[PDB]
Enzyme design. Structure first.
Site, mmCIF file in Angstrom:
data_model
loop_
_atom_site.group_PDB
_atom_site.id
_atom_site.type_symbol
_atom_site.label_atom_id
_atom_site.label_comp_id
_atom_site.label_asym_id
_atom_site.label_seq_id
_atom_site.Cartn_x
_atom_site.Cartn_y
_atom_site.Cartn_z
ATOM 1 C CG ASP A 98 9.788 -16.203 7.575
ATOM 2 O OD1 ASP A 98 8.795 -15.957 6.872
ATOM 3 O OD2 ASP A 98 10.263 -17.391 7.878
ATOM 4 C CB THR A 107 5.812 -15.908 8.395
ATOM 5 O OG1 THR A 107 6.609 -15.281 7.465
ATOM 6 C CG2 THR A 107 5.206 -17.172 7.769
ATOM 7 C CB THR A 108 6.306 -10.493 8.206
ATOM 8 O OG1 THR A 108 5.328 -10.162 7.250
ATOM 9 C CG2 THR A 108 7.592 -11.145 7.574
ATOM 10 C CG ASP A 124 6.609 -15.490 2.304
ATOM 11 O OD1 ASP A 124 6.447 -16.559 1.630
ATOM 12 O OD2 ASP A 124 7.018 -15.313 3.610
#
Lengths: 506, 480, 529, 525
Positions: free
Chosen positions: C50, C83-84, C383
């Site tokens: 993340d 975010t990844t 997510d």
């Protein structure tokens, strides 16, 4: 490792930006203060790189190429460092890509190989333009006045230096024979044509006014022998209880030096020259016979006596014969700034013409010597092989778009490197427009559409702040300039990308 | 603070984190294993063969080795049986991933792909070498506990010690009728009181209440002890509890506190023995079994330290669920009692895993050699990019018995060369002898372990290496 | 409290230091990347992919880079993922913006060149935009789920989760915003347990509370339909006072403990089938629950019972009270559910609430190897469910794997020649910067970068090269990546797609955030006194 | 303890740098000594000579590369690369505790089998060793041992200079004469790389200070080598002048002037237009030679004069006198010319008479690149020594593909000889995969796909047939290397039998030398 390569590239980025004011006549001066207290100020990108001091070891690549470009062209050679500096800066993201540095070096190898083929096609023979022996070198000398600091005083040398280079024999060209002596002080319009050897001033004691400074038809005689009384005489054992035999020690050399000066004068030489300094004993002898003598003949002065004058050097006074003596039509000694200059004139056998450079600035007088020397190298290679390309930096732009045509024939992974070499080639005119204040994007968009239509030679002159052709403006460049520039810059780029680590001991 | 490592430095620092510790634990394997000494911040030392406390006291400067302790806790909570031959497998993987990692420039995800394929073929090998046995025979579990206690001299007392735990094993069981023999042995607590003999331990099928009765000379027999879940204050309040239970007429009494003099009048008129306060946790033991009824007999014993109370239901149903009991351990000395607790307390998980998977995998280094051959066979068949990494996994299982050979100090090449034939081709029961350091039959010599021992370990060990291959950058020295 | 720095250093030292930090997080981009270890200094660490977690714990001494860290906070609110993967796009935006400002053009013309390009970039995406429709079954929702499962180590196990996440989000399906499908955040309860495997998870179309019964002897199952359930906050726990007779203080505590004993007795008067108590309950009060067939629960979290009142619709009460001063339990606080079934997963019971009234909810019970695994699986599915949320909210989806950045090349190249002037150079740099994202994927793929990049340019050029109105094929559209064989494969056959919100209102918000850094002229730092 | 930590960590430090020093992709490195002189070269063996090394185990391996320069010196950087890989395989055995005696026996048994397999790798011996057509197959791959910038110019100049710098004879046996000094290295900055050619004359760096008049057409120059300087006979000690009367004082200067006049006149009577002087020239001599116009030679000590011994063929004579024709050499033309932009003394012979020597002019802009060319010139002499000294050099597959087939042969040697060393030989049989691993690292190729394809292309020998394809197979260095395995004979990429014969023989004992060190005892200073 990998970070060492980027560190070597970033070390040359500060040099590339520092050399922007160098290349081009519209650039600016750079002050370099050395350990000799003499500040180097020049508008030409060659002399600057000669005395330029560096720090990081990788900067020696730009130092080594600076000495090679001086022996080839001599002016406007900063583009060699600009191209080598920009290719490394553009390849920074490419090193992180999947392309190894070898395929990048092989890309520059194929780029310069295809560039020479284009330069040979762009080479135009000037003899087909009906250019006579004058307009050929005259138009080439006027365009060679660029890259130099003072343009106004350079116009005074246009109609002169051409006749000065033509005064040298066109069958045999030598740089040391055409060598020019520098005179500190005086206006730039005060120069003269000299056919013979020049001296700094002179070394004399007491009254120097008793010697006539001008002769009609003197016989030039240059000798390396020293005239002195008991100088190099080794320690000896002299046992004398008498008077005259003890007094004869000094009187023997005083009588011998009288015989040496007599045998030299019997040959008819009104000009006596010596290598090592001499005493004041010959003053009274030379003043009564109206014979001028000057010693300490330098190395450059000896080479002029050999070829131009054609004299000889004989140490033994009794062995001096008229076959070892020279001559001349007129001997005139001109004085500038309370300094007299011995000048040989009227020498039909002399194949060279020496110029006297008079200037008030110490930084300019050093550039003017190399300024005229650059034109000598231009007239040299151009007279043997006549090739004309448009100057001002627009020669690479004709190739720049042409390099994109070879990229269409590649059709592979190396095309990105060829497209990068063609894009990184356009930084040279952009830096020339930066010193001129022109817009980077506005001119570059015009530079691309320039060669897109008419092709051939379109120069985009920067003096009129408009677009045009430098060929119609009579702006010329030797074709051998960019030939040795692109060939030498390729090996400079191949050396930087090939070094993965730097080892320093102690 | 940064403490970040990129490029080749990131992989080298993480491999050497647990690499130096892997060589320290090489003396913890086998019945010939040494005993490691620890140094705490207080200067004291703890001498034991259990690797759980070894990695906890030792402070490693690299955070990568801290997960191995957490990865060890997972195997201790799930299995926690025979850590001498088990927990050492946590450090036998990363040590064998060293030869080719950076040198071949192989990306860790490529190694992760070979790690996922190695787990698929490993699950088939665990149940392939396993063989079923009778699950109702208690004599088979007697020799199994004797295998893990060989680090001490308790083998002489193993007859009472093995039957001490196994009586509680068959006592609990029974969490389900059909689908698997789940149980919970945590309800059975082992009390260790120095002094006396091990034979003083009383264990059988039922609920053992460890407490005393009103008076030590009170009658020791009760017909049906039915179980039900200063002076002036104690006699009035407690009487309102124990005597109130008598409404359903039980003959057994359970209170929180003792019995006073006034309560003895109405409690003893029922014609039975009255039991005073019962231990708090003992109420949770009978709460599983059962107002409870069908209690067969009661008995009370007398010995100086503490007293005993026997409560035998003898019929749980009329299905039902597991029974809970109590165990008291009486050692010969103070230092002897505390050291032998590791083998007896782990005996609960010994037979617990037998109920899970009645099939039995070969022990004594035979399981690691069986897996090493199967991984070497599937390597030449798969080929591809997995050829190099999946072959090194076979060598990882081969170095585990090499550690057992290190205790003897011989040449593993001589033994492993013969194990590639008599074991792979011959039978899965071929292994390395621990005592003589030779090749003998594991089943004939008596070295064997349940399938859950190898199944829940190797499967967890392979999955534990995932965190080692996912390391990229390390960030520390900020906050949390 | 300090000096100031001006000149080209702000355009360089602040940008290059940001590039140094930006190049670090690029190793986590794509499923072929790696994860960073975050050490807590306490002996434990958390290895996660993340970007919001890594950049938060990462020490940043440059205020210019703190703005890019705050992007993940606002991105997770509007999008909920990236975010990844997606967050990396904000890195290279400053890479090529530095080379332009170091020569001539003022950053204003460069940024306004991005503004006119970003204004038409939304329309350029709409041209290549492929709406979600005419697809067989759940293949769309399955492909979007597998794309959300990308960049995670459990992506191989996604063969199960892909079918579970689709049905789990259909369970939480509600109606709000005047007849619009909504999936409330946090309505899906994620539970963790040690055992089994990833594919062994259970799909629960309702809320699941992880807890155990108060007394271990209480009934473990309550049968029957239409079972009521209630949540109670009642607490069971143990001035000038002149002490004379001990019976005075004993009578006070007898009434206090007596009323509290009555507080449990007033619950069965309203017919409560299931009682949920926030705090503990003594074993004496649990007798009324056995005779009334009530399942008691103690030691509950306030956030756990708050989600029950939202999903089920019951009213939470603090203690016994009514409109009057009497302490009792009214029947208006009772909820309703389909059935109460206790599922025991790794010695942990679960309260299954089916047929919710106020808001439809679901739960997911994850069983896995160990802590650091399940701890990573928490952010994995946190997510992932937000990606499909924006898929069914807006049917516009864009291709992933570098397809958008490869298609916008010709779009921005032809648009740069249209505007011209001094903005043509800035637009060309904005197009070449977006091509770095697939180049970073090749770094973690251990393959040749430009080999695929030359294919991203060539195979995607046939779209605008040939006339699209004349068909002629030669263009499969997407192509864009393959993560295994290193070949050019269409995204339709690969089954990897992402919502348009992953690009629109993502790079559009990131570009407007990055141009503020180029606006910075000087820097002033004041040290704390 | 010394082998586990000190030996492995110190050798692997420079082992990672040597990975770029072998193959046609070899990369240069910058090394600055303690004196401050910068050095750029692509040869690791040249690095270790000027490199300052502390740890002794690395210094021992440096002497192994110095012996290679005496014999082969072509592609010998593998000695550092192979030993590093042999220690990596041994590092696995050191952690296991395997006896070092079995390791030494592993290389000894493999060395006997390796030398026997090299005799089976020889194909197409070249017996001509004269014309450029037959030498093109040998010389061209030797050019690949160094910078690949231009492989056409470097290969053509060496093949052309054969008939020039090397002794030319009908049939020359019995170790024909060859010398490292047969090619003079002249580094002059400036000029394109294509301007380099082979000149039958000789060039020296100096400027004549006199009246010199170059004689070109008529040629016919007389030159002699003089040991002592040109002057009257001088006393080696310090004498004392004796002056008494006026005759000794006045004739003191006339005595030394008149004697040197008659001494120098005897040289002019032989028609001597140039001389060879190892010592300096007095001032009185140059003054009298202004009338005669006789050259002087300022060249340094005899290490330069050794080249003139073959050129002129004159024996140094200390006394001047009248040198006999035995001490008189022959040169066609002596003139100062401008080659690379500077004026130096140049002997230009259109058709000259010169014995077993010549020169090669080097034209380049970068002087640092000329240092690598000097090392490439030594490879040309090394290629001559490789042909001349042994009965023949045969041919060997190049591009590091030699040991690829040797792995399959040595692997069978371990299986055909069962025992305790069967597993030790197999560990040392696959240890030769570092050669394709080293080159592919600098070739931009991934060894994951490429290396098994190299084994899949060679297989055992071939499919069923009578033929050998594997001898013509090798790793591809080119932009097309991603397509597959390119051949060699098509490009004529070959190696020499003595190259790998002498390298493996020395590396066999060099690998066991480091592993035989129990502990390193050092001392201060």
């Amino acid at each position: 490792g990998k970070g060492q390569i980027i560190s070597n590239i970033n070390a040359c980025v500060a040099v590339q930006e520092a050399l922007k004011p160098t290349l081009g006549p519209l650039g600016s001066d750079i002050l370099i203060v050395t350990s000799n207290q003499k500040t180097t100020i020049s508008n030409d990108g060659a002399t600057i790189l000669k005395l330029l001091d560096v720090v990081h070891p990788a900067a020696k690549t730009l130092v080594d190429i600076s000495r090679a470009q001086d022996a080839e062209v001599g002016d406007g050679t900063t583009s060699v460092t600009i191209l080598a500096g920009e290719l490394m800066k553009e390849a920074k993201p490419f090193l992180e890509e999947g392309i190894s540095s070898h395929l990048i070096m092989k890309g520059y190898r194929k780029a310069v190989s295809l560039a020479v083929e284009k330069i040979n096609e762009l080479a135009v023979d000037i003899t087909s333009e009906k250019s006579s022996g004058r307009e050929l070198l005259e138009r080439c000398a006027r365009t060679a006045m660029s890259s130099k600091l003072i343009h106004n005083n350079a116009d005074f040398f246009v109609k002169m230096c051409v006749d000065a280079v033509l005064s040298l024999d066109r069958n045999d060209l030598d740089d040391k024979l055409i060598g020019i002596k520098k005179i500190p002080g005086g206006a730039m319009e005060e120069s003269l044509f000299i056919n013979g050897v020049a001296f700094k001033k002179t070394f004399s004691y007491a009254g120097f006014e008793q010697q006539p400074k001008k002769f009609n038809n003197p016989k030039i005689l240059s000798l390396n022998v020293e005239l002195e009384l008991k100088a190099e005489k080794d320690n000896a054992e002299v046992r004398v209880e008498h008077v005259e035999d003890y007094q004869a020690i000094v009187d023997a050399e005083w009588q011998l030096i009288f015989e040496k000066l007599r045998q030299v004068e019997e040959t008819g030489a009104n000009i006596v020259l010596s290598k090592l300094p001499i005493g004041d004993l010959a003053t009274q002898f030379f003043a009564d016979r109206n014979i001028f003598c000057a010693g300490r003949v330098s190395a450059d002065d000896m080479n002029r006596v050999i070829q131009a004058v054609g004299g000889s050097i004989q140490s033994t006074t009794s062995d001096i014969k008229p076959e070892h003596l020279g001559t001349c039509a007129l001997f005139e000694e001109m004085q500038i700034g309370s300094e007299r200059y011995n000048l040989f004139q009227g020498c039909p056998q002399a194949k060279t013409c020496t110029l006297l450079l008079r200037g008030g600035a110490e930084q300019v007088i050093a550039e003017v010597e190399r300024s005229l020397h650059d034109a000598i190298m231009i007239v040299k290679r151009a007279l043997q092989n006549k090739l004309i390309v448009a100057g001002g930096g627009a020669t690479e732009m004709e190739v720049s778009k042409c390099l994109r045509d070879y990229s269409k024939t590649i059709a592979g992974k190396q095309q990105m490197i060829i497209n990068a070499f063609a894009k990184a080639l356009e930084v040279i005119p952009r830096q020339l427009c930066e010193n001129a204040g022109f817009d980077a994007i506005e001119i570059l968009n015009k530079l691309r559409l320039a060669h897109s239509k008419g092709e051939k030679w379109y120069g985009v002159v920067f003096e009129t702040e408009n677009i045009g052709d430098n060929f119609a403006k009579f702006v010329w460049e030797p074709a051998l300039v960019k030939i040795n520039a692109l060939n030498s810059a390729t090996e400079a780029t191949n050396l930087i990308l090939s070094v993965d680590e730097t080892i320093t001991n102690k | 603070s940064q403490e970040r490592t990129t490029g080749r430095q990131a992989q080298i620092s993480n491999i050497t984190a647990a690499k130096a510790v892997a060589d320290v634990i090489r003396t913890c394997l086998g019945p010939k294993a040494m005993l490691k000494m620890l140094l705490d911040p207080m200067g004291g030392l703890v001498l034991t063969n259990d690797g759980h406390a070894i990695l906890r006291e030792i402070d490693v400067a690299h955070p990568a080795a801290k997960s191995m302790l957490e990865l060890s806790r997972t195997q201790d909570e799930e299995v926690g049986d025979g850590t001498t031959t088990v927990i050492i497998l946590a450090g036998e993987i990363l040590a064998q991933c060293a030869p080719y990692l950076i040198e071949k420039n192989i990306h860790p995800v490529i190694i992760i792909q070979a790690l996922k394929k190695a787990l698929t073929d490993a699950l088939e090998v665990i149940k392939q070498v396993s063989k079923p046995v009778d699950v109702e025979n208690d004599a088979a579990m007697k020799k199994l506990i004797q295998a893990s206690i060989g680090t001490k001299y308790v083998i002489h007392w193993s007859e009472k010690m093995c039957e001490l735990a196994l009586d509680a094993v068959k006592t609990v069981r029974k969490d389900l009728g059909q689908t698997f023999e789940i149980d919970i042995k945590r309800y059975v607590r082992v009390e260790k009181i120095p002094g006396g003999d091990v034979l003083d331990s009383r264990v059988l099928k039922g609920v053992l209440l460890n407490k005393d009765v009103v008076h030590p000379k009170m009658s020791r027999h009760i017909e049906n002890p039915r179980v039900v879940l200063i002076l002036q204050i104690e006699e009035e309040q407690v009487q309102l509890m124990c005597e109130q239970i008598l409404a359903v007429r039980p003959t057994l009494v359970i209170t929180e506190k003792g019995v006073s003099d006034l309560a003895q009048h109405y409690l003893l008129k029922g014609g039975c023995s009255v039991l005073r306060r019962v231990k708090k946790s003992d109420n949770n033991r009978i709460a599983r079994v059962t107002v409870g009824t069908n209690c067969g007999l009661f008995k009370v014993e007398m010995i100086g330290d503490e007293y005993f109370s026997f409560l035998d239901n003898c019929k749980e149903p009329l299905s039902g669920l597991q029974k809970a009991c109590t165990i008291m351990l009486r050692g010969g000395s103070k230092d002897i009692l505390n050291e032998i607790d590791r083998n007896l307390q782990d005996a609960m998980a010994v037979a617990r895993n037998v109920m899970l998977s009645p099939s039995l995998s070969p022990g004594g280094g035979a399981t690691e050699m069986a897996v090493s051959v199967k991984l070497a066979e599937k390597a030449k068949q798969l080929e591809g990019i997995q050829q190099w990494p999946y072959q090194a996994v076979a060598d990882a299982m081969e170095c585990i018995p090499r550690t057992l050979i290190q205790n003897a100090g011989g040449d593993p090449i001589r033994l492993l060369s013969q194990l590639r034939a008599k074991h792979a081709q011959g039978n899965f029961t071929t292994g390395i002898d621990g005592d003589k350091g030779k090749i003998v039959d594991m089943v004939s010599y008596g070295i064997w372990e349940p399938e859950v021992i190898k199944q829940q370990s190797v499967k967890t060990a392979i999955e534990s290496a995932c965190l080692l291959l996912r390391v990229d950058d390390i960030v520390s020295g900020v906050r949390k | 409290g300090g000096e100031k720095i001006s000149g080209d250093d702000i355009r360089n030292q602040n940008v290059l230091a940001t590039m140094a930090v930006a190049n670090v997080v690029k190793s986590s981009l794509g499923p072929v990347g790696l994860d960073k270890m975050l050490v807590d200094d306490i002996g434990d660490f958390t290895v996660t992919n993340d970007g919001a977690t890594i950049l938060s714990l990462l020490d940043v001494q440059h205020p210019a880079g703190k703005i890019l860290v705050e992007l993940a906070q606002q991105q997770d609110r509007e999008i909920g993922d990236g975010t990844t993967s997606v967050v990396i796009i904000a890195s290279e935006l400053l890479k090529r913006a530095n080379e332009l400002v170091k020569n001539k053009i003022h950053p204003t013309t460069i940024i306004t060149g991005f503004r006119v390009a970003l204004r038409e970039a939304i329309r350029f995406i709409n041209e290549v935009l492929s709406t979600s429709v005419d697809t067989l079954g759940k293949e769309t929702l399955i492909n979007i789920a597998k794309t959300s499962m990308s960049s995670k180590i459990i992506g191989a196990d996604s063969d199960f989760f892909s079918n579970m996440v689709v049905d789990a989000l259909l369970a939480v399906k509600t109606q709000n915003s005047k007849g619009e499908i909504k999936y409330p955040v946090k309505a899906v309860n994620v539970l963790k347990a040690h055992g089994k495997s990833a594919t062994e998870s259970l799909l629960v179309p309702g809320y699941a509370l992880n807890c155990t019964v108060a007394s271990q002897a209480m009934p473990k199952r309550i049968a029957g339909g239409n079972v009521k359930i209630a949540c109670l906050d009642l607490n069971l726990q143990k001035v000038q006072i002149n002490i004379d007779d001990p019976e005075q203080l004993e009578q006070i505590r007898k009434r206090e403990a007596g009323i509290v004993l009555e507080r449990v007795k007033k619950i069965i008067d309203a017919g409560a089938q299931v009682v949920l108590t926030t705090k503990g309950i003594d074993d004496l009060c649990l007798k009324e629950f056995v005779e009334a067939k009530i399942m008691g629960v103690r030691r509950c979290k306030k956030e756990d019972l708050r989600r029950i009142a939202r999903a089920t619709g019951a009213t939470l009460v603090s203690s016994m009270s009514n409109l009057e001063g009497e302490e009792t339990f009214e029947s208006s606080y009772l909820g309703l559910c389909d059935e109460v079934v206790q599922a025991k997963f790794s010695d942990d019971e679960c309260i299954l609430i089916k047929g919710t009234s106020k808001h439809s909810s679901s739960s997911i019970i994850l069983r896995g190897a160990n802590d650091y695994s399940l701890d990573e699986m928490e952010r994995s599915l946190h997510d992932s469910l937000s990606v499909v949320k924006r898929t069914l909210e807006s049917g516009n989806v864009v291709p992933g794997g570098g397809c958008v950045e490869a298609a916008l090349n010709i779009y921005l190249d032809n648009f740069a020649t249209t505007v011209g002037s001094r903005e043509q150079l800035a637009i060309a740099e904005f197009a070449a910067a977006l091509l770095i994202i697939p180049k970073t994927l090749a770094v973690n793929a251990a393959k040749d970068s430009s080999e695929l990049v030359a294919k991203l340019r060539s195979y995607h050029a046939a779209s605008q090269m040939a006339k699209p109105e004349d068909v002629k094929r030669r263009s499969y559209r997407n192509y864009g990546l393959d993560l295994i064989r290193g070949k050019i494969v269409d995204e339709i056959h690969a089954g990897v797609l992402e919502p348009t919100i992953s690009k629109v209102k993502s790079l559009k918000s990131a570009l407007e955030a990055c141009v503020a850094i180029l606006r910075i002229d000087t820097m002033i730092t004041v040290d704390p006194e | 303890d010394g082998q586990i930590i000190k030996s492995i960590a110190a050798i692997r430090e420079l082992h990672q740098m040597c990975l770029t020093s072998m193959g046609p992709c070899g990369r240069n490195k910058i090394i600055v000594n303690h004196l401050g002189k910068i050095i750029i070269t692509n040869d690791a063996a040249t690095m270790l000579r000027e490199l300052d090394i502390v740890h002794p185990a690395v210094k021992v391996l440096v002497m192994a590369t110095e012996q290679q320069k005496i014999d082969m010196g072509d592609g010998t950087n593998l000695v550092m690369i192979l030993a590093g890989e042999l220690l990596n395989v041994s590092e696995k055995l050191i952690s296991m505790g395997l006896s070092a005696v079995e390791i030494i026996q592993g290389y000894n048994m493999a060395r006997k089998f390796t030398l026997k397999e090299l005799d089976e790798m020889v194909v197409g011996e070249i017996t001509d060793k004269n014309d450029k057509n037959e030498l093109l197959k040998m010389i061209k791959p030797v050019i690949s041992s160094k910078k690949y910038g231009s492989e056409d110019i470097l290969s053509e100049l060496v093949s052309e200079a054969v008939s020039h710098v090397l002794p030319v004879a009908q049939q020359a046996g019995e170790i024909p004469y060859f010398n490292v000094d047969s090619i003079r290295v002249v580094k002059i900055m400036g000029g394109s790389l294509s301007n380099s050619t082979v000149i039958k004359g000789m060039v020296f760096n100096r400027e004549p200070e006199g009246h010199v008049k170059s004689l070109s057409e008529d040629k016919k120059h007389k030159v002699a080598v003089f040991t002592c300087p040109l002057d009257i006979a001088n006393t080696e000690t310090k004498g004392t002048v004796l002056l008494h009367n006026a005759q000794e004082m006045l004739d003191f200067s006339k005595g030394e002037e008149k004697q040197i006049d008659a001494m120098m006149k005897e040289i002019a009577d032989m028609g001597v237009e140039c001389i060879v002087a190892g010592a300096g020239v007095g001032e009185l001599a140059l003054h009298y030679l202004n009338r005669y116009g006789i050259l002087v030679l300022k060249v340094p000590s005899k290490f330069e004069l050794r080249r003139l011994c073959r050129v002129c063929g004159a024996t140094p004579l200390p006394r001047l006198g009248a040198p006999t024709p035995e001490e008189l050499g022959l040169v066609e033309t002596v003139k100062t010319m401008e080659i690379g932009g500077d004026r130096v003394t140049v002997f230009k012979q259109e058709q000259g008479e010169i014995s077993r020597t010549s020169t090669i002019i080097l034209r380049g802009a970068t002087q640092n690149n000329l240092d690598d060319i000097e090392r490439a010139i030594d490879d040309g002499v090394a290629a001559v020594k490789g042909l001349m000294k042994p009965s023949g050099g045969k041919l060997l597959p190049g591009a590091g593909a030699t040991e690829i087939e040797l792995i399959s042969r040595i692997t069978k040697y371990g299986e055909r000889t069962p025992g305790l060393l069967q597993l030790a030989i197999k560990q040392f049989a696959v240890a030769f995969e570092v050669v394709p691993r080293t080159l592919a690292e600098t070739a931009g190729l991934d060894v994951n796909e490429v290396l098994p394809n190299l084994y899949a292309a060679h297989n055992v020998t071939e499919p069923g047939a009578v033929k050998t394809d594997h001898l013509y197979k090798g790793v591809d260095i080119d932009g097309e290397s991603d397509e597959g395995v390119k051949d060699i004979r098509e490009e004529n990429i070959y190696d020499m039998l003595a190259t790998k014969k002498f390298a493996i023989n020395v590396a066999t004992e060099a690998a066991t030398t480091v592993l035989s060190i129990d502990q390193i005892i050092m001392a201060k200073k």
